[PDB]
Ligand binder design. Sequence first.
Ligand code: XM4
Length: 119
Amino acid sequence: MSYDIQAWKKQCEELLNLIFQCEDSEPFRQPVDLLEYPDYRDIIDTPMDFATVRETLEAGNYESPMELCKDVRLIFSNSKAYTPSKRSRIYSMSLRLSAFFEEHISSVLSDYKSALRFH
Ligand SMILES: CC(=O)Nc1ccc(Cl)cc1C
């Protein structure tokens, strides 16, 4: 529906489903195991992963698509900080998936901002 302030919840649910099914999401699907990777929290202030984002959305704990968008960007910016080398296949995966996410989210954001002006 045009001007729907609730539309972003279904749009983000479906975009996350597409991300999970994409091979480039593999490293970012679940929280980093800290006892497996002991220096992760030395580098990363605020861990984030797509399972946390999906669970937060399904629980209704995002107020806006901007909030969900901030958490997804944190996944990609954490990857660039932990895996900064352009040689890394993981660097390449987060680059491709970030570009994919940013392409889909832009219209979710602008539709939401239109809907909120209307409301
Ligand atoms: C989300 C994240 O950066 N995870 C990760 C990536 C590459 C390597 Cl080699 C190890 C880990 C734990």
